[PDB]
C-alpha cells in the first residue's frame, strides 16, 4: 500500500485496477474500501470515503500520480462509506451510475443523488473498459450491488462482504439479514473466476470472503432465532 494524505492508502491489484483504504473517525477510526479503475487516462471511482475532504485528496492523487481524471462513479449502496464524497464529485462533474434503489434512498434522505439508475444489471464503458454492475438482492443494505471487472477478474463486493478476519455481522440497520445469505449464494455462483474479491471494510482476498461472510451471517441468523 501507498500511503497518502487524509488517512488514505492505495494498493494496486493490476495495471488498471487499484484498491484504497480510507480510515475515518465515527462516533472509532473505521477503515473503508473502494476501487480506482483506469483506462486511457480516465478513472472510475467505485465508492467514496466518508466525506468531501478525503474524496478530494484521493481524486487529486489519482490525477497527479496516476495521470487519470475521475470521470465515472458507482456507489455500492447509500451509506456514507459509499457516497459521502459524492457532493464534491458532482462539483467536479463526475458522471454516476447506481442501483435505482440507491438513487431513491439517497433522494428521500436529502443525500447526494447519483444520476442514472439501473434496476437489474448495467455495464458502463470506461472509454472501452467494462465495469459490470449487478444487483443480486438485499444484503448489508437493501440496495447493495456488486461491480465486476471482467477484463481483470476483480470483484468489488462492497460491504455485503466481510474480510477473512471478520467475526461479526456488523451494522444491520438497513440490512436484509434473511436475504443476505441468498445474495451471497448468487454472487459466488455468478463469479467463480474471481482472482481478487474486495470487501466494504478490510483486507481483500479471493472468493473465500463470500463463503466466510455467508458463515458469519448465517451464524447470526442462528443466534437470534433460538428461544
Ligand atoms: Na467505500
Ligand atoms: Zn453500509
Swiss-Prot record:
Any one cellular-component term (Gene Ontology): periplasmic space
Catalytic activity: a beta-lactam + H2O = a substituted beta-amino acid
EC number: 3.5.2.6
Residues that hold Zn(2+) 2 according to the record: 81, 159, 201
GO annotation (BP), single: antibiotic catabolic process
Cofactor binding note of this UniProt entry: Binds 2 Zn(2+) ions per subunit. It can also bind Cd(2+) and Co(2+) to a lesser extent.
Protein's UniProt keywords contain Transmembrane: no
Positions with a binding annotation for Zn(2+) 1: 77, 79, 140
Principal localisation: periplasm
Entry cofactors: Zn(2+)
One GO MF term: zinc ion binding
Keyword Nucleotide-binding: no
Regulation: Competitively inhibited by 4-morpholineethanesulfonic acid (MES), SB236050 and biphenyl tetrazoles (BPTs). Also inhibited by chelating agents such as EDTA and 1,10-phenanthroline. CcrA is not susceptible to inactivation by the beta-lactamase-blocking agents clavulanic acid or tazobactam.
Subcellular location: Periplasm
InterPro entries in UniProt: Beta-lactamase_class-B_CS, Metallo-B-lactamas, NDM-1-like, RibonucZ/Hydroxyglut_hydro
Protein family per UniProt: Belongs to the metallo-beta-lactamase superfamily. Class-B beta-lactamase family.
Role this protein plays: Confers resistance to the different beta-lactams antibiotics (penicillin, cephalosporin and carbapenem) via the hydrolysis of the beta-lactam ring.
Subunit details: Monomer.
Protein name as catalogued: Metallo-beta-lactamase type 2
Originating gene: ccrA
Amino acid at each position: 500500500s501507498v500511503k497518502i494524505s487524509d488517512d488514505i492508502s492505495i494498493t494496486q491489484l493490476s495495471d488498471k485496477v487499484y484498491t484504497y483504504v480510507s480510515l475515518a473517525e465515527i462516533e472509532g477510526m473505521v477503515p473503508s474500501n473502494g476501487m480506482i479503475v483506469i483506462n486511457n487516462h480516465q478513472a472510475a471511482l467505485l465508492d467514496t470515503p466518508i466525506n468531501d475532504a478525503q474524496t478530494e485528496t484521493l481524486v487529486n492523487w489519482v490525477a497527479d500520480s496516476l495521470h487519470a481524471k475521475v470521470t465515472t462513479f458507482i456507489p455500492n449502496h447509500w451509506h456514507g462509506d459509499c457516497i459521502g464524497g459524492l457532493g464534491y464529485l458532482q462539483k467536479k462533474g463526475v458522471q454516476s451510475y447506481a442501483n435505482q434503489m440507491t438513487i431513491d434512498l439517497a433522494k428521500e434522505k436529502g443525500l447526494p443523488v447519483p444520476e442514472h439508475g439501473f434496476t437489474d444489471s448495467l455495464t458502463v464503458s470506461l472509454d472501452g473498459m467494462p465495469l459490470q454492475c449487478y444487483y443480486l438482492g438485499g444484503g448489508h443494505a437493501t440496495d447493495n450491488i456488486v461491480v465486476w471487472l471482467p477484463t481483470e477478474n476483480i470483484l468489488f463486493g462492497g460491504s455485503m462482504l466481510k474480510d477473512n478476519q471478520a467475526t461479526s455481522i456488523g451494522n444491520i440497520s438497513d440490512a436484509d439479514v434473511t436475504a443476505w445469505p441468498k445474495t451471497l449464494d448468487k454472487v459466488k455462483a455468478k463469479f467463480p473466476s474471481a482472482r481478487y474479491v474486495v470487501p466494504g471494510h478490510g483486507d481483500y482476498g479471493g472468493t473465500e470472503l463470500i463463503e466466510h461472510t455467508k458463515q458469519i451471517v448465517n451464524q447470526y441468523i442462528e443466534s437470534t432465532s433460538k428461544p
